[PDB]
Write a protein that binds this ligand. Structure first.
Ligand SMILES: [Ca+2]
Ligand SMILES: [Ca+2]
Ligand SMILES: [Ca+2]
Ligand SMILES: [Ca+2]
Ligand code: NI
Ligand code: NI
Lengths: 213, 213
C-alpha cells in the first residue's frame, strides 16, 4: 500500500519503550520475502536510533521518549527490499510530528529587575516591565503561556501593596497613592511567573523599584 | 579616618588584576601595628574572593572583572585589628556599585512569533506584538534599550513591505493595501531587535502572519 499518514506523538511519553507507531507494508510481499528499513535524522543520522523498524514485521517503533524542544518534527524515509537485494518501492516519506507537553518551567530573563518612578505619579502609571520566557509552545497550547503575579512587597509602608502587575504583559504599575522618597526610597517586590496561564508551575524573581523625587 | 565613600566600578574591566580601589586606614595605626581585613558576600561569603584587602598596607583590591547582571552592588565590611589581636574600630561598611557596560545582546522571547489579521482591515491596524529583552540597564544607559525593525518580508506580493513595526513597542502593524488571502495566505517577516536604541548589536527572529478571510 505504501503511504503513511503523518504521525503525531506527544513528547515525554511514559514507558515502556519501544512502542509501535505504524506497521509498514508493501503489497508485493505476496511475490517474495521483504525486509523493511528506515533512514533519516532520528533513524540512521543524529540523534541516532530514536526510531527503528522491525525488518520482517515492518513495525515502525519509537525507542525513547521525544522532547519537542530539541526536535519538533522528524522526516524519515521507508525502504522495502527483497531477500535478493532489490528495492521494490520508491522510498516513502514518514513524518512524525512531536506535540507539546509542559516539561519546562518559566524562567525570568533576569534574577533582579530594576525600575524607577517619580513619587508623584498618578495611580495607574507604568513603572517597569518584567519578563519570563518559557520553552514550551505558546501558540497552540498554554504550556508556554506565562501569567504574572506579585507575591509580596517590602517594606510594607505605607500599606501592603503600592503596586500591581499586568497578568499577561508583566507591566508593573502604581496602584496606590503615597509614594515618598524621604519616607521609603526603595521597594522590593517578589515577582512570580506561572505557566499554563496561571495553572502550572511557578518561578520567582525580584523587582527593585527606586522612588525618585 | 575610618570611613569609606561608595565606590563605583564599571563591569567587565580589562586586566591587569588585581586592581586597587581604595586604601583603608585607621587613625589608631600611630599607636600599634594594624592588620586589615574584609568580610561580606564578595569577600569571605559567596561569591568568595572577588575582593581582597592587603593585610599590611590597607589596600582594598578587586581581583576579577565584575558582572552587573550577576551582582550589581556588594556590601562589605572593613576591620582593623592590633598585632596583639584586639579590634580597634567598629567594622566599616564599604559599598561597591557596579556600573553598566553593553555585554548582552537583545534576545527575542521566542524564535518564532505568530499572529493573524483579517484581509479587510484598514491600514494602521495592529497585527501582533513581538518582544525582545536586554539584560543590560535601560534606566541609566542605552545598553538595555531595544529598537525594533523589519529586515525583510516574504513573499514580496503585492509589494515589498505590507507591514511596519513600532520602533519601541514591537507592535507590528498593516501599512499598505492589497492583502488577499487567496493570493497570499501567509507572510514571513524577518524581525530585528537592536540595543543602544538602534546603534548597538542586532538579534534576529521571524514573525509569521496569517491573513484571514
Ligand atoms: Ca511551561
Ligand atoms: Ca514542551
Ligand atoms: Ca545590551
Ligand atoms: Ca551590562
Ligand atoms: Ni529542555
Ligand atoms: Ni550574562
Amino acid at each position: 500500500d505504501w503511504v503513511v499518514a503523518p504521525i503525531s506523538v506527544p513528547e515525554n511519553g511514559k514507558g515502556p519503550f519501544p512502542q509501535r507507531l505504524v506497521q509498514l507494508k508493501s503489497n508485493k510481499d505476496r511475490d517474495t520475502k521483504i525486509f523493511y528499513s528506515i533512514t533519516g535524522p532520528g533513524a540512521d543520522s543524529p540523534p541516532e536510533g530514536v526510531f527503528a523498524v522491525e525488518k520482517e514485521t515492518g513495525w515502525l517503533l519509537l525507542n525513547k521518549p521525544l522532547d519537542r524542544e530539541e526536535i519538533a518534527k522528524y522526516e524519515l524515509f521507508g525502504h522495502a527490499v527483497s531477500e535478493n537485494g532489490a528495492s521494490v518501492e520508491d522510498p516513502m516519506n514518514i513524518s512524525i510530528i512531536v506535540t507539546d507537553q509542559n516539561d519546562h518551567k518559566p524562567k525570568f530573563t533576569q534574577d533582579t529587575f530594576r525600575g524607577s518612578v517619580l513619587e508623584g505619579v498618578l495611580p495607574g502609571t507604568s513603572v517597569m516591565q518584567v519578563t519570563a520566557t518559557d520553552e514550551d509552545d505558546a501558540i497552540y497550547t498554554y504550556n508556554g503561556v506565562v501569567a504574572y503575579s506579585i507575591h509580596s512587597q517590602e517594606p510594607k509602608d505605607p500599606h501592603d501593596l503600592m503596586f500591581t502587575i499586568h497578568r499577561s504583559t508583566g507591566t508593573i504599575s502604581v496602584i496606590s497613592s503615597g509614594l515618598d522618597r524621604e519616607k521609603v526610597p526603595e521597594y522590593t517586590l517578589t515577582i512570580q511567573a506561572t505557566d499554563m496561564d496561571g495553572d502550572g508551575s511557578t518561578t520567582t524573581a525580584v523587582a527593585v523599584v527606586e522612588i525618585l523625587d
